[PDB]
Target: L-rhamnose isomerase
Amino acid sequence: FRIAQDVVARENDRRASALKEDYEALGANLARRGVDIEAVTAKVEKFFVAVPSWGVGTGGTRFARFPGTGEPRGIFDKLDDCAVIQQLTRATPNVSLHIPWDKADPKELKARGDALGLGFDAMNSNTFSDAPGQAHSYKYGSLSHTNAATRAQAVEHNLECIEIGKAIGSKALTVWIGDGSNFPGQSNFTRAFERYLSAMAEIYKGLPDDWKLFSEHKMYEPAFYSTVVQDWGTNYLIAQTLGPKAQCLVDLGHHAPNTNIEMIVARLIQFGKLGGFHFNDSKYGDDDLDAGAIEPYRLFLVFNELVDAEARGVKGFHPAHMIDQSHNVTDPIESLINSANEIRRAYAQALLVDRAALSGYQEDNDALMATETLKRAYRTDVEPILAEARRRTGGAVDPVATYRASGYRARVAAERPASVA
Amino acid sequence: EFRIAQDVVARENDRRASALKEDYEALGANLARRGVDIEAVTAKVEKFFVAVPSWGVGTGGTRFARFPGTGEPRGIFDKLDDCAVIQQLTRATPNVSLHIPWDKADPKELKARGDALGLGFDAMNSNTFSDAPGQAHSYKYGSLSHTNAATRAQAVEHNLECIEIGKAIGSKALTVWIGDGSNFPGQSNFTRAFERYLSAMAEIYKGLPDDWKLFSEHKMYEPAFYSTVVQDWGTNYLIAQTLGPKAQCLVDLGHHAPNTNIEMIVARLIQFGKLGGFHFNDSKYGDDDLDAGAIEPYRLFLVFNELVDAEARGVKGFHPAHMIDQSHNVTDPIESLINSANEIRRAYAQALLVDRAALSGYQEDNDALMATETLKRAYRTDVEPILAEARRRTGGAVDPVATYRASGYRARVAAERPA
Amino acid sequence: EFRIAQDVVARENDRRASALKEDYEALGANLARRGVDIEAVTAKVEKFFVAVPSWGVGTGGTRFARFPGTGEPRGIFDKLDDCAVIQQLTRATPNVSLHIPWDKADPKELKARGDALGLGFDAMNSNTFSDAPGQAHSYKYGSLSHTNAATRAQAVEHNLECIEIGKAIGSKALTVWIGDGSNFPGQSNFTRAFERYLSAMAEIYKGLPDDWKLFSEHKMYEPAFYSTVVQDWGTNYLIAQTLGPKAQCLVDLGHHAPNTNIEMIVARLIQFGKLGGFHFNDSKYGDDDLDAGAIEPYRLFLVFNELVDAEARGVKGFHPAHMIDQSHNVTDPIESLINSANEIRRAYAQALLVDRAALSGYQEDNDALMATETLKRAYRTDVEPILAEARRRTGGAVDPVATYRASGYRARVAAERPASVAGGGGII
Amino acid sequence: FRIAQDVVARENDRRASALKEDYEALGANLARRGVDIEAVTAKVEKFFVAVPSWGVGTGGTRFARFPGTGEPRGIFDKLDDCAVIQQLTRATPNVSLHIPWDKADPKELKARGDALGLGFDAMNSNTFSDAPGQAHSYKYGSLSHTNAATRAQAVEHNLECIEIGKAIGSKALTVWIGDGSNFPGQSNFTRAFERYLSAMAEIYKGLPDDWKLFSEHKMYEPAFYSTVVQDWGTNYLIAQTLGPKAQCLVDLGHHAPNTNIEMIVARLIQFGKLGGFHFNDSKYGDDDLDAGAIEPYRLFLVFNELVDAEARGVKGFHPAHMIDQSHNVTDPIESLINSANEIRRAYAQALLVDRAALSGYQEDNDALMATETLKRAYRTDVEPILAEARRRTGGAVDPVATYRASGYRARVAAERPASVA
Model:
């Protein structure tokens, strides 16, 4: 146990009275609305989102990185920190690894995971940066690089990610690359995309029968003029071209200003190509901020689409959700905790929507009551539900407060040496 | 008189009184545990008012089409009758803002009708973004900043007329939003156009009563698609600062560039004493003029967080002239204004719930996570019971839209008004 | 017929003939030093055409107001007379795109008038984004994707009628742009609305002759301010792929989210054979519908770079149906359409100057600087002499707007057509 | 000379004939337009823009930095490379230094500058990152930090920058900070600004009589929710509040999407607060791309405002222009050369605008002819003017071609060791 049980118990007991009052008050209010709070809590306690191993360390910008104390030294320290998030929120049982940052003996990774009560989600390849001893640089691209040898090198890297994943229990490979151009004319849009499609087709052939290959679009950054996989349209063309095992990932902050992101989610689901959603929030670009910290309603609207799919009876829909954030000015663990909380919060609210009433207002084109039907769910404070779900599953009623009371950060700060060079 | 039968209001209130008592008492207990007296909040909420636009009671449209509903108001008198419903049921919109010449009519009759309906009059709104019948000079190429002196003079005179009308009905301010700008690079000389605007506004200011305020409203684009004279809050500040103490800036939510941090603009204008008021609506793409809070309710809350913080910081002489400015293209205008007025009080109530002492502590200690969580604890609170009880206690409806529909008001005016 | 007196055209051409010869010969020498034959470029420019929207010759407006000019066209026939002026002077707009029901009239008269004016007819345009007098079902909440079956059927029938009208006048395509969408979250179920749209379009598709095309046009927003059924090229692609071989996508410059790489979308649609055509205009904020190239001329060039690259790589079965779609709120509509058609040919001509071999080399070598400079060398070239000479040799004017103004055309039609009144837009 | 004179002479003679033909042809065309090409050329050869010392090194993103060969390390290597840009373009005689990156003995800096034929422009302070041994971190801000000692440290650093500047011939201090917040509530907008204003007042007091203090606004990055100096409005409030010696800098890529930047330039000039413009181009955010590579017309429209002011000599209008770009996928020297070229290009074209005719069309509301009057200038290919201006002043007809012919990059590659073979 990363966090002492007596601490979790103590902090839970301290807040039990208030939780009881709020939960029972909410339960009665929901009952008057025809909703069984117990049915909602039962589903909330089973909603999981993968945590990125790279999100536990402090992030930075091109201008600077301001590390906190006790920064994880490697993947094993990162898993240790991910275990804190899972123990306290019970919403992040699986961790997504990034290669080569997290490269290590697969057996040791699996053993540590099992010891901490953590599983492993989708593997993530890295061809947006150069690793030591690399025969070819990814400065001008990777999977879509003009140089055949460079693409082959990128392909082999992705195949290695699959091998590592097969050894630790992973069932998917996520591919996000920075490939693109910074100047008009620098790249031939079509040929670059063709090169990418050819390389991804090779990676696709290395997929086990029960694996998925996820491609992730991004409007810009690192490329500032054009990006090969720039939007969901190109992303759909990729997944449709590659095959049944290839699907698209939607990262909230990877879209143009004012984009209706929830619609993209709906479109991909309709055509069976929504592999998963990567959570974070943003205001300007791919800010990678804590989920729901900027636009909580948008997060709820994305979940409304995810829940409606289930309501419509979409078959074989098992998206692979993951948080992908950079924590530049907070304790990474605390941000991941509250971000996972916001995600469950939006999910819980989406479950409260009176779909029967909504379908009626939609058919009669009663726009005001339709939007108000969504708002009645979104306006509901579901914190008591989230808190009870945690209590029941061994988590903390107030995760961050408990984390702080445990003195975990100070503890790892004394155990881990800060990098000097 | 009452546009909505008092027995319908009573009936629809009693029907929901039991559940409201339950929700209000529960929220009261929760707030008490948080060191907040729900009664103090309700008391402030029932005193929060936002002006309704006379032009918002009719169905709006786009350049592609307008799809009117039934019982559309024929003139300003029908509009006042409809605005009276919004005030009667929400009790949050006691004042109506008129637009000239659309609402031109015997000011004396307007005031009489207002008093009878329990409505007051807010800021006057001039119109030099469209041509009126018999108008000598067209505003096609501008008004107050038009290159032709005679055209600017006509625009100035029109604004002065708006003032005369407002003085007769109890208005204490003139809001100036013009479409002046250009659609092509080179069409206008940015500086000369602005100089002309400033000189024209100075004439209006000269004729402004000393118990009135003059509001200028910035807009990034539309109707101008390349440049706009009063394009942003920076230019707006220059205008207000140049004109005088009685001149201030109006911030309309949907009038900013994509991703703009609007709540910061609000804070900046307050700090320099030039925030005349805020015009509410919501948007996703541009100046969509949608129902307030229908798209980004948190942003609305953040704007109110700055308004409430101004009081908390002890800012003096701060009395913003708030107004709703929306276009209702696919809903019953009355229902939208009702729920928009509600959303505005909702964000206000949540802002009142912010533990300012705690927030200040987290800000000084640079505890970003707890600081943002402190705002969220307020925002996540469902204040609907407070809004409903405030309405119930002041003569309004627990559920305004439900009561509105139960009254059959729309069917009623549809029969009294042409098709 | 000649809307503009031939003597005026000749007069204004002779007046500028000397300077043109000097500039054309100078550019010719410069291009020669660059291994380019100016005659080869002029020859292609003279053959580049873009359809003109019938509704574009009238003064446009916003939801706040409309400020009509003098001599506003009363209907399709007046509009055709005005379009004829654009074609006569620029020689770049031989075909006109009709909009129904605005231009509804006897197919025989339409065709007869076009022939007399030297105008052909391009893609038909359906209108289910507004209500017409006596209409049985309102399109307030949608049309092809409306929740009401009868409303959808009415919309389908209207579109089929557009195809019938087009078959009688020489048209070979139907363009479908609707405002269908929502203004509030929850108002529409995104997926169900799209399913309804697809099903309705499938019915329209069934009525397409074997040599006809069906074009769907995406738009991020307006009139819908929360969601739009056909919101972007991604959805547009799904439509075209679902409907069939005869269904393709139209890309309207100002219909994209801020900062979108529009030229890439063009390339993507070409790669997958679904580029139905490009609708020209320019913008700075949203769907401003401004004169092409008036705001971002380089972006216009970059779009043409993708079009010309395809036109050079032999891309078979590539005959995009280009059209101008602009709103002229503060200029004489005819003059704007004239200079817009000119800007389009300007971008095209510059794209033709790109050294494709050199560019290909810099791309393979990842020489970003020289690759971008290769495009700039073409774009920086002032091809006005080529455009003017192309017009001169084909019966057009060296300086179209100058000739238009010298002819007194506007004042003429102003004296023949009833006066128009200014007013407010759909705002109220 | 960084570049051998014989190479410059050889590559000039190689293109002399074609240049003579084009310059004469353009001179004749301009003559027919009532314009004297010589008057334009004379001004163009005198138009200068400062080069950032940090611009000659390869730039990167938060994902990676892909260095080229012969990367300059330290201000001395950087000045050596900046000298190449000046020798070949003759448009960048002054270099802007950044402290502490360029910290060195002033006498040695001044000595090296004079030897290379380079002067020193505005000083640039750095409180958006932490230097080793720093007492207080700038993680949560600097000049506007809640901690007094942190603000005092930032103020002292800026004063040290002025001291360094005084010793090498600089006459201004540019202040761009990352100060802001990533979460709603993290900062109190008004209080943070009050602290900033108070700290800048202290810096202003240390300004010599002939010095200027420039504040630079930026919408976002590194702050992803709010930024203290977020736009020109706040920037104006700063300059007007500080005093006569304080003005505002406008960096092209620091604005919200679709912003009309040329209008901002005009507004600041009208109120005497345009301290200078920082050139670069962009498509998505603060991309810091080569000037004019994305939107050359916008660059021309900005210069249309600058030239209009220059023609009349507006009170307080004496801009301190500088290039501020990041070269992530090109040879930094080549990009700076062609960027400086684009800047002079737009300047030259703005010089061609028939102001009398334009004013006439503006007064008559003839929008079509007014815009066409600008286009007639913009459509003019002024390359012959730029090339002749360089040739007449000791520069190269074709800067990049001459740079490549000289083999400079391979030369410094041999003198400077890369991190890896």
Q: What stands out?
A: Residues 6-33 of chain B form the longest helix (28 residues). The CA atoms of residues 290 and 297 of chain B lie 12 Å apart. The domain at 1-419 of chain B is CATH 3.20.20.150 (TIM Barrel).
